[PDB]
Structure 1
Amino acid sequence: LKSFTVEKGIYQTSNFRVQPTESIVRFPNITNLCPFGEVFNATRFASVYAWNRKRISNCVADYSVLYNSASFSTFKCYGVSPTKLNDLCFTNVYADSFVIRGDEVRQIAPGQTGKIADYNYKLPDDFTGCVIAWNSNNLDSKVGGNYNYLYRLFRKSNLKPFERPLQSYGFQPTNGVGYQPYRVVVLSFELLHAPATVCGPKKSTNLVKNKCVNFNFNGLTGTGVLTESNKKFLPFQQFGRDIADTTDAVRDPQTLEILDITPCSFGGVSVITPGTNTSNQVAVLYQGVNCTEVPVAYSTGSNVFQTRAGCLIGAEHVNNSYECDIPIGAGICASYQTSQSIIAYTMSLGAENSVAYSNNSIAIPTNFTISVTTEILPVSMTKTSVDCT
């Protein structure tokens, strides 16, 4: 009120809102998988000269089922990360599957050195395929040594970007550290090139109820209280909307059930007090709020009373009748009295009277009293004009 003294009465103040209690994430589980399990784990790969090129689309690039593997030493992308692949949708993914010398794993990486690398796998200048190094010595190993995976490709003509060494007798487990055969697996994917048809996986957490929590269900993020609901969703309808076309009910993705959404309590707050010099004892009211949550943010209370218009704190209830002094709502009114304290009560609409009706007696006045009363009415206010410019 921008004043050091305030008149007796009720005055609106800053509202109140129940802040969230915690966050909850509920989602379905690992869904269909893109043909990646085969590319990063298989019994046999394609030949080095016949380096595999598999187009992948119309599936889910589920990085969860792929990253659950612990055999990887360093699996991170220079521009992205697998962890944040839950909410990334791919257009098409190219899978390159071939068996080469172990020392040639990095030579498959872009920006490498060596004329023996482009002989069997040319290095394009705009390769976004993240490099992956993993052990495949057992898979690529043969007892006598497999020489079939030769690098005889020695074409003299320059190799264009994706237009289509032999220091070991064969792929043998006896090869030393860094020399054992390695299966180079790269998820070479491009965006903005083909229509979006591949989307990522999701993650879930535990469930809670009867708490102001930030719930995320199937990408629907919102804060509220989750309570079991008896509403019967259809087998395919996962949520419902009110006449206001606003989500009100949500079906759990993991378990099959229906839950409500109830935004946690909030409402205005106001103060009731006598004049400043009158006293320094105040009453706080929470319109449309319950004392169930008033200890959230005077949290002790010690004098609380429920009311249809909210729950009052710091005031004393009275079961007597008096004329309304400071209205509260629902026929409730406050006054300051005796020691002195603020009190609330049911307003006294007026002193009861009952005329002695007999339709046979008549009350005729004996005399009168002339009275003078004031009436005040505005008739005008000060004029006004302005230069727009």
Structure 2
Amino acid sequence: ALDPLSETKCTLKSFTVEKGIYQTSNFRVQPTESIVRFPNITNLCPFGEVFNATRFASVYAWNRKRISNCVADYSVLYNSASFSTFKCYGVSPTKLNDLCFTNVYADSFVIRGDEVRQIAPGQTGKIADYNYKLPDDFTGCVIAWNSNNLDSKVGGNYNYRYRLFRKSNLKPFERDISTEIYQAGSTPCNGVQGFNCYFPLQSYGFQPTNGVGYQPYRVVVLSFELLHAPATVCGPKKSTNLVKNKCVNFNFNGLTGTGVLTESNKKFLPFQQFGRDIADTTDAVRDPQTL
């Protein structure tokens, strides 16, 4: 590699170079930089409105929202600092952006501060067994923040109740709103309160003067389940700057390669994104974002 004349000796494997033209190698221009282009982030699912909703269902009344067919950006929720506690199980927060999920269920409800510790795979306690429980394989995440500035009001708010007693422990992802009276012993009840007969639902005392530990916390539980159905919800996109008239390595959607991007007069059908030649090698492509 010292000089071009030396390349002839190495290509011919001899120390003597005869008079003539010799090809010692084949030069190739390497890509200067990598190009990245994708479509917009528009038409998302309003995850912020889930926790932003004015009223949330009771621990027994918890609503289950089905989120699918959109793009999800989790960096805004983690970097917003609007959550009191954020933790995940089985999946890291930084890896959610690179993973596509088929179905995302966002749980909503309000529970006591000390009751948030009972939410996790294979937990116990009153709220976990008799209200809401997480299966051992639950891959989702947990989110909670102090609602004392909204839910709790002067005089107390009894609108949020819970199931104190149940004949057994609730199954994973099971919701029972039955108000039937709980029978402690063998004494018949028949819906009439009395000895060994109690009302299972109980209201959470909510006032701004209560301790921080018992302050109501609004919890949003996202259930990540990957089924045999196709995947839709995915993380955000990038769509970096574009460069033309230069050697670069470009990746467009699920297509990759190295070449020089130059705008031509060819017109691709609006229903046809990519072109191809007789050799099945794409000679041109359409910007996934701009047309």
Deviations 1:122-168 (Å, cap 9, x if unpaired)? 23222112222344443433333323222233103232222329999
SS at match of 1:151: strand
Q: Does 1:154 align with 2:150?
A: no
The answer as to whether partners of 1:145 and 1:171 remain within 8 angstroms in 2 is yes
The answer as to whether partners of 1:87 and 1:202 remain within 8 angstroms in 2 is no
1:66-105 mapped onto 2 (5 Å cutoff): 69-72=80-83, 75=86, 77-105=88-116
CA RMSD of aligned residues (A): 3.3
Cα distance, 1:212 vs structure 2: 1.8
State the alpha-carbon separation in 2 of the partners of residues 98 and 250 from structure 1: 48
Change (3 A) 1:242 1:48: same
The answer as to whether partners of 1:108 and 1:123 remain within 8 angstroms in 2 is yes
Stretch deviating more after TM superposition (239-248 or 2-11):
2-11
Change (3 A) 1:210 1:50: same
State the alpha-carbon separation in 2 of the partners of residues 121 and 107 from structure 1: 9
The answer as to whether partners of 1:239 and 1:249 remain within 8 angstroms in 2 is yes
Cα distance, 1:26 vs structure 2: 1.7
Change (3 A) 1:221 1:79: farther
Cα distance, 1:197 vs structure 2: 4.6
Change (3 A) 1:156 1:246: same
Change (3 A) 1:72 1:212: farther
The answer as to whether partners of 2:31 and 2:258 remain within 8 angstroms in 1 is yes
Specify the alignment match of 1:112 in structure 2: 123
Change (3 A) 1:210 1:195: closer
The answer as to whether partners of 2:126 and 2:164 remain within 8 angstroms in 1 is no
The answer as to whether partners of 1:30 and 1:64 remain within 8 angstroms in 2 is no
Cα distance, 1:35 vs structure 2: 5.6
Deviations 1:235-266 (Å, cap 9, x if unpaired)? 3333322222322222223xxxxxxxxxxxxx
The answer as to whether partners of 1:93 and 1:190 remain within 8 angstroms in 2 is yes
Change (3 A) 1:218 1:64: farther
Cα distance, 1:188 vs structure 2: 0.5
The answer as to whether partners of 1:78 and 1:130 remain within 8 angstroms in 2 is yes
SS at match of 1:132: strand
Deviations 1:60-105 (Å, cap 9, x if unpaired)? 4454665674424665644444554455332222221111112322
SS at match of 1:134: strand
State the alpha-carbon separation in 1 of the partners of residues 204 and 171 from structure 2: 30
Identity of aligned residues (%): 100
State the alpha-carbon separation in 1 of the partners of residues 84 and 23 from structure 2: 62
Cα distance, 1:191 vs structure 2: 1.0
Structure with larger RCO (C-alpha < 8 A, sep 6+): 2
Change (3 A) 1:201 1:179: same
Deviations 1:342-379 (Å, cap 9, x if unpaired)? xxxxxxxxxxxxxxxxxxxxxxxxxxxxxxxxxxxxxx
Q: How many residues align?
A: 253
Deviations 1:263-298 (Å, cap 9, x if unpaired)? xxxxxxxxxxxxxxxxxxxxxxxxxxxxxxxxxxxx
Q: Does 1:252 align with 2:287?
A: yes
TM-score (normalised: structure 1): 0.55
Unaligned runs of 5+ in 2: 1-11, 176-199
Stretch deviating more after TM superposition (144-153 or 78-87):
78-87
Q: Which structure carries more helix by proportion?
A: 2
